């Protein structure tokens, strides 16, 4: 039915993106 949206997949992707972007930024400020 067109009255359904897979919000769990989009939400999961957004949380994974936020996690990767934040850990990458942390690697950016830790130049070693």
């Amino acid at each position: 039915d067109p009255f359904y949206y897979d919000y769990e997949t989009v939400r999961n992707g957004g949380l994974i993106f936020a996690a990767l972007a934040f850990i990458v930024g942390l690697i950016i400020i830790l130049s070693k």
Partner: protein, 996 residues
Amino acid sequence: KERDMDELKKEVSMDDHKLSLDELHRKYGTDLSRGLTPARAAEILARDGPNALTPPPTTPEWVKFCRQLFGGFSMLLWIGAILCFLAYGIQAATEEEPQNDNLYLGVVLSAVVIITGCFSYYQEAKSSKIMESFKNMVPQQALVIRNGEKMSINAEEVVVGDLVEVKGGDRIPADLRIISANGCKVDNSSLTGESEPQTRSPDFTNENPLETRNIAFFSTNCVEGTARGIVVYTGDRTVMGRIATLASGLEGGQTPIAAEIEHFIHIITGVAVFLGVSFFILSLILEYTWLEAVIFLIGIIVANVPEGLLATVTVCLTLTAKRMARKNCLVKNLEAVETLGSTSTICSDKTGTLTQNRMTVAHMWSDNQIHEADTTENQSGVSFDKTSATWLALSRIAGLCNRAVFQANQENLPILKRAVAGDASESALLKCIELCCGSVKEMRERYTKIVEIPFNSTNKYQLSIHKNPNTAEPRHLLVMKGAPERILDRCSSILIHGKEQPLDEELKDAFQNAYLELGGLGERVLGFCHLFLPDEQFPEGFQFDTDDVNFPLDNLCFVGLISMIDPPRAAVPDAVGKCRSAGIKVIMVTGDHPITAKAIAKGVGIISEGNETVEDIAARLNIPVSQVNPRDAKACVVHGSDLKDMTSEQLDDILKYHTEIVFARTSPQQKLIIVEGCQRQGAIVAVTGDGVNDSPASKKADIGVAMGIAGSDVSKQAADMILLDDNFASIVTGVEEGRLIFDNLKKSIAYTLTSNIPEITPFLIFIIANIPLPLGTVTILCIDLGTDMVPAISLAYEQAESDIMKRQPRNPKTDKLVNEQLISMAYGQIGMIQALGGFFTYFVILAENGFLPIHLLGLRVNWDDRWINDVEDSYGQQWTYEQRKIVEFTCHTPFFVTIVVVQWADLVICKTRRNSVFQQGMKNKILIFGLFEETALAAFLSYCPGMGVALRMYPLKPTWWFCAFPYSLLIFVYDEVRKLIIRRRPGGWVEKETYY
């Protein structure tokens, strides 16, 4: 009535020193050789107060915490919180089921102010805490003669009118009136700035109590000799006491950064109330009532108040102050970190600040040639030639014929900073021999001294005879030193490369010109000579008792002169050059003698080589000084004696027509007068000093710089910045950082001020077009105090785009921190595009869910209604209340995300004000993390489970993340062509209209 009290303290002191010993003992009632009875001493001790300055005014910690809770920026946020609670109070009593938004915002603004206060308070308190760790006040007991007996009592138990004795090394307790001296030399450096140890004689010499020798002063140290005296002044009534009390009771002024923030708030609230009032009238003209229009006015005014710019500006200043504390340049006041950059006229002190305040061997004479020795504080200079026989003889004459030796603990300390017991001149000689000629311990004991002759009161000469340890000649080695005029009369032989020659005038006149060269250079010169006593007329058994002529006074062998002076610190000349390069006027203000002040000025850079004073031209032309036109003289020396008879206009002319000025023999009060004269011109002033005489000058100056170790406690407390390492180059670093953080603050402010247009425009058109609310309040908080915090803080880490130490100091009346160009950029061009991008994402979300944009007009009337659950969209569908409200909140979330997307480009373009993003480069790692954290945080606030419940932020369909991309690219390209036209065309359109 404290005005009169301060006025009687701005005047130079008076005295009664010029009195016969009988008139003095009659006025004070004291025995000249027995002092007074202990009962009389206790009666005065319990009559006027102990001999100690009244403690400073204690500053309770709740006072400065409330201070951090107030100010100019925090006050704007306070009025914003008050307006929020006023609006909420109106909304509570007047309408049904009032909204908690305004209350939420008011408590948030209050929390922002309180947190900023806690942070800034902890920082200033940390600075003062590490400052208390520098007060090493060791009690010092004075030697007082009372009832005919000598007793050592605490300095505070000393009273007025009692006999006091001081020994070489002891500190002058109170202000004494010398009655009997024995070759006594005191140290008036920390008080009157007099570098060389000024001797103290019982006879009155000068009408000025500071210049005369019959007066010892509070906080001064008796260098050599012993003396007696009657205490004339005690406690706060003393000279340095009146100076310290004047310093404590002076005005601090308004720092330039503070005035800039105030002007910034003036423009912020100006446009805020303009928009609020014009929209209040517009709302009443449309349909809304006074009840609603008042809430609109408060919402528009409060919305235009940067809530996070306070914490960002504070952290900016804190970061730069952190770098200052890293280089041992501590700032007591936070905003004081910026004043150095805005400075345009530096008034410096000579003794202890421009110089090392220590006698050092400057130049030597040998083979009719001048040899300059290394006079740096850390020994990082050129070393003279130390392989000739003339040096091997002169070094022994100095290392042997000298009453100077190291003390007990002088082992691990360096050769220069270590303490030496004796005369300052002999100390400089001992250090130079111990540094450039091995060691003087084994060199002095190698030549066993037989008979010596110390310095004489007339024809000052110091001689001594020693045994000869050479394995080729057993003749006695006699050495003697003294003034060159006393040694020239007792010399016939001259040493050269190892052999002797007669006193031919061809080289004797060359010695005279060398003497006048080292003398005219402001240095003190001495002559050294020696002679081999014939072991045939004075065998090894004969004892030359110091009674008659046992040594030939004349026919000696002169080896060479040895000059000495207090040399400037290592990086002092280079620092002065850097300051002048940045367009900062350097003016020396010292109480030392003019003959030495002019030499040190020319040696450090205050007086450029080639420039002539009003007297130099008259001397070069052999004409009276009253004839030369002062306009033909760029530099000028102003004596303190003449400064006393000056008016305001005269001092104004001295500073306006003379570029290199040197104030000599100036009292601390005159130093304050000079600082005020410089401030009358309207320029930022920085006073750099160490002694107590720098307290009233460092206090009244826009920014005071005290020496962390070589400085006095009074001027160190009355200052605004401390140099814990005494590295005068820190002044240059300070003037650089002060300009650096200034420009970075401009960038950071333009960033926070750009986000206000897309934060207010949704509400504005919500009032006009009557469309559903495009942007929510909590989302606005997630932008101002959420994402944008890291980019704005990272904007402080930006470096110089061009050379900042090259441009002239900013004009306070022209280059303001937030000029009308920043408003035209943030509020006018960039923020406008960001607002359009937000509205685009808004219309995309609503048109895709069934509400075409054209249909959104006049829809908010029934949209916001909580009971109309059948709201027709553009497709004929019926929407309930919560369904369409879910769309409005899931419509606020992408508006916030759109803000972050446009802030990416806004941050990259604000990072560079004139250079291109490709020229400067994304080398700011904090900025990269700022964008990464900003985006990750924005995504987390939308996709975290339970956000549409707590913060009412619902998840976004991925295509929403791209509705804002073209606007960001547009912003970036627009600002890029802006900076490109500014680069290619530096004349006026793009520069005077948008370049802020």
